Design a protein around this ligand. Structure first.
Ligand SMILES: [Cl-]
Ligand SMILES: [Cl-]
Ligand SMILES: [Fe+3]
Ligand SMILES: [Fe+3]
Ligand SMILES: [Fe+3]
Ligand SMILES: [Fe+3]
Ligand SMILES: [O-]
Ligand SMILES: [O-]
Lengths: 143, 144
């Protein structure tokens, strides 16, 4: 591996860089769909290509995070081995279905946004399904 | 009014949901590559399929954000129209190349991590290129 990054500002900067690059890929693919609808195929293709750049950037941030002994930006769990990667996926999905999306749904209903609440409730059930499927993966890797 | 979400906690939750879903898709595609190398194609395929779920979630969050008159989670700029979307991309990439990545690179060098610094410098130049390409897009939308 590489030099230990724990405790540095660079460790936090890699995390923040990963967050921004992740958002950018999602944003640019969403924007490309609007270009698609409106008939701007060269713009849409450029947006998709820039999005591939942001993928490369996000993955490179993860490379340095993993090689520097740091944890997953999303879950604060190690992601050195495949088993650890799956354990990180389980931890994040579990946070999302047990805490995050149910709370978002409750708040949306309290604030008078039942349609948004229904979306958050759909997502809560979806993340529970994801968590169960990843748990099945881990069981198979450890057997 | 679901069409005016400004200032509500639900607005903040949509933003945070978008951030988490965006990271999840990137993480699961990265993890899939390790499964690929090691010969676990069913695990890799599951990671890729779940990642498509996280794409749908992120895009749905953006749908509610736009429909509610809220701004881009990354830039705090409106993203209703295509021109606005491109203007948001320009603002974010400009921040990344003029401030964010150069600052990250300086810190990495000062902390004794030259390989990470070089990566941040490569990314700074890349985001400058991205900003210029988005600027060209805006020129084309405006008539160029
Ligand atoms: Cl075009
Ligand atoms: Cl497999
Ligand atoms: Fe980037
Ligand atoms: Fe999830
Ligand atoms: Fe999700
Ligand atoms: Fe960028
Ligand atoms: O980026
Ligand atoms: O998720």
């Amino acid at each position: 591996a590489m030099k230990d990054l724990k405790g540095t500002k660079t460790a936090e900067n890699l995390k923040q860089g990963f967050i921004g690059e992740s958002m950018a890929n999602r944003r640019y693919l969403y924007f490309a769909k609007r270009a698609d609808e409106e008939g701007y195929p060269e713009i849409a293709g450029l947006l998709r290509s820039i999005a591939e750049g942001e993928t490369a950037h996000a993955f490179g941030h993860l490379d340095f995070i993993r090689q520097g002994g740091l944890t997953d930006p999303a879950t604060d769990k190690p992601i050195g081995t495949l088993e650890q990667m799956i354990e990180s996926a389980i931890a994040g999905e579990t946070y999302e279905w047990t805490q995050m999306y149910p709370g978002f749904a409750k708040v949306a209903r309290e604030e008078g946004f039942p349609e948004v609440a229904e979306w958050f409730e759909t997502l809560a059930r979806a993340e529970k399904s994801h968590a169960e499927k990843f748990q099945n993966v881990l069981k198979q890797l450890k057997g």
